[PDB]
Amino acid sequence: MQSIKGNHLVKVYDYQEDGSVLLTCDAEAKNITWFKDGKMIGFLTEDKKKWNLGSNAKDPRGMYQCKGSQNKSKPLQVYYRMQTPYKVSISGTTVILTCPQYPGSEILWQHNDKNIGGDEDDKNIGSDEDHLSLKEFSELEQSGYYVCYPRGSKPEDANFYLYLRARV
């Protein structure tokens, strides 16, 4: 989530005064080249380096990745609601996330570098196979980076993280 290790250089700037979604690239600044769903969407030659996705009210979504002088970074699955990606389902006030890779092995989940869905002491947070259920989703509290990983592996080794921002 907060760390860029594992080629997860793409992060969301949560220092916005207006409801605009800005993306940042953690690469040696020379020129940042941005991509969305594989296609190039911009080329920043020095000066600015953040990518503006527009107002959050337009529900920006897509697999965003950047690239400096090295090779492209891992994707950042953006999912706003105001390679196989994570599946997001909203039903009333319940948000359900589906792990893209479910080989049948132990699926674990983490939210902002914090484990979730393991303890049964949480009625509003259940983990059922490759599905993470979030009941009574709190926009300000439950939004952020999410990632699923198999027991024994490092979360940073995931093919990409999921950035969820939802008003329910």
């Epitope: 092995s105 132990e106 699926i107 674990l108 484990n115 869905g117 393991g118 303890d119 983990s127 198999p150 027991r151 024994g152 592996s153 490092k154 080794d157």
Partner: single-chain antibody, 465 residues
């Protein structure tokens, strides 16, 4: 699955030679781990992060490599390094281990001064017992075979020498009229006949071999002769207990000044580790023998001697017997059985149970009790070692989440469960087959070190009709 290849599969090298083991992965691996497995023991993590030495690993071992090629090096091979070395990858499940490199000594006893004594003698009072000590690997006519006794309930007590080249024996006054020591230079074996066995003569009689700067350099196995119907050195600590890691210090006092007329103080400390013959630790008042860790460091002068083990480890537990030979009859101390105070902090232990012999098709449940740490903070893994095969990963379970993952070969027959209230993981094996026979070991996985650092002693499982 990423395939790990270890080369060579078996290596023989002489003491002191540099030994190199290579590990090749079928795919680029982020980190490689190296484990040392002694015959009959569980795997012990030696190197993590492909270059980092585990706690207690001597600096003579080193790991290196990146991508798909890794190398493990022993700069100076030691007799205690005889074990099977395994490399393990953790980048992807299942955690794959190499076939194992069986490391042995090329020469060994071929040239190593190895004295082999008679042993296992049972007598009756008033009789005579004669014990031999076949000295090999050295000019048996060039070193005296001094014979030392350690009665139960008392420290080491010398019992007289013999210079096998000439047969001219010295003897101890407490047996000068009773025990006779004779050499057989042709067969390279010194002998000791103790006559008129009493009640207090039941003991272990060791045959040393007095070296140049040390007495009792290489000691025989020791002969326990159980029969039933002097500058006094006392060791100030006795059964002094310490915590694994905590520095310890056993003091020892001399009845007179043990500074010899020649100016060299023949004070020494020998550490009879449990089940082993005493083996020298501080060759003079201060010098450490060759092959002893830098941890053991004696000190003292005048009449009082103190031994300071700088960091008590698991292997240092055992009686340190203080011997002074600047007096004519070599007299030892009472010796302080330095012991681990059990808990001594986080007793990270994995206790395995539930093994046995089961019929084909039946079910067996193994249990792994974790102590000394938060059971829910680390993943518990199961590894199987078949007779003659390397380590095979079975699966792991996350105690905090219940997350389990298994190897495809056993996913449909084995079930991994855990009990957080008892800090115990369970490995349920259903429809057992003869191919499932082996030692099952439980291991704690530390995500921060990406290595299985704590391993259970293993539970043997035999599938036989």
């Amino acid at each position: 699955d990423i395939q790990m290849t270890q080369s060579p599969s078996s290596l023989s090298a002489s003491v002191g030679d540099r030994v190199t083991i290579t590990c090749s992965a079928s795919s680029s691996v982020s980190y490689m781990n190296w484990y040392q497995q002694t015959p009959g023991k569980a795997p012990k993590r030696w190197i993590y992060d492909t270059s980092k030495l585990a706690s207690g690993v001597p600096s003579r071992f080193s790991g290196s490599g990146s991508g798909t090629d890794y190398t493990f090096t022993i700069s100076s091979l030691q007799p205690e390094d005889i074990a099977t070395y395994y490399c393990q990858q953790w980048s992807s499940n299942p955690f794959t281990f190499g076939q194992g490199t069986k490391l042995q000594i090329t020469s060994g006893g071929g040239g190593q001064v190895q004295l082999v004594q008679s042993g296992a003698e049972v007598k009756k009072p008033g009789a005579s017992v004669k014990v031999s000590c076949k000295a090999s690997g050295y000019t048996f006519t060039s070193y005296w075979m001094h014979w030392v006794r350690q009665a139960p309930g008392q420290g080491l007590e010398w019992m007289g020498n013999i210079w096998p080249g000439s047969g001219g024996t010295n003897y101890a006054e407490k047996f000068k009229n009773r025990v006779t020591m004779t050499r057989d230079t042709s067969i390279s074996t010194a002998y000791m006949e103790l006559s008129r066995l009493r009640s207090d003569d039941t003991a272990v009689y060791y045959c040393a071999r007095s070296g140049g700067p040390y007495f009792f350099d290489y000691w025989g196995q020791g002969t326990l002769v159980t029969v039933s119907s002097d500058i006094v050195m006392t060791q100030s600590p006795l059964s002094l207990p310490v915590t694994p890691g905590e520095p310890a210090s056993i003091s020892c006092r001399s009845s007179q000044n043990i500074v010899h007329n020649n100016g060299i103080t023949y004070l020494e400390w020998y550490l009879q580790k449990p089940g082993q013959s005493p083996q020298l630790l501080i060759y003079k008042v201060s010098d450490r023998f060759s092959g002893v860790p830098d941890r053991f460091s004696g000190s003292g002068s005048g009449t009082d001697f103190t031994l300071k083990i700088s960091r008590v480890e698991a292997e240092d537990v055992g009686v340190y017997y203080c011997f002074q030979g600047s007096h004519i009859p070599p007299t030892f101390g009472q010796g302080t059985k330095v012991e681990i105070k059990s808990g001594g902090g986080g007793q990270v232990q994995l206790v395995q149970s539930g093994g046995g012999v089961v019929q084909p098709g039946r079910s067996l449940r193994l249990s792994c009790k974790a102590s000394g740490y938060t059971f829910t903070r680390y993943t518990m893994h199961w590894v199987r070692q078949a007779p003659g095969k390397g380590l095979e990963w079975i699966g792991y379970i996350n105690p905090s989440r219940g997350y389990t993952n298994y190897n495809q070969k056993v996913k449909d027959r084995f079930t991994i469960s855990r009990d957080n209230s008892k800090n115990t993981a369970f490995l349920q094996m259903d429809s057992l087959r003869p191919e499932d026979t082996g030692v099952y070991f439980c291991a704690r996985y530390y995500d921060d070190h990406y290595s299985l650092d704590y391993w259970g002693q293993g539970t043997p499982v035999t599938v036989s009709s």
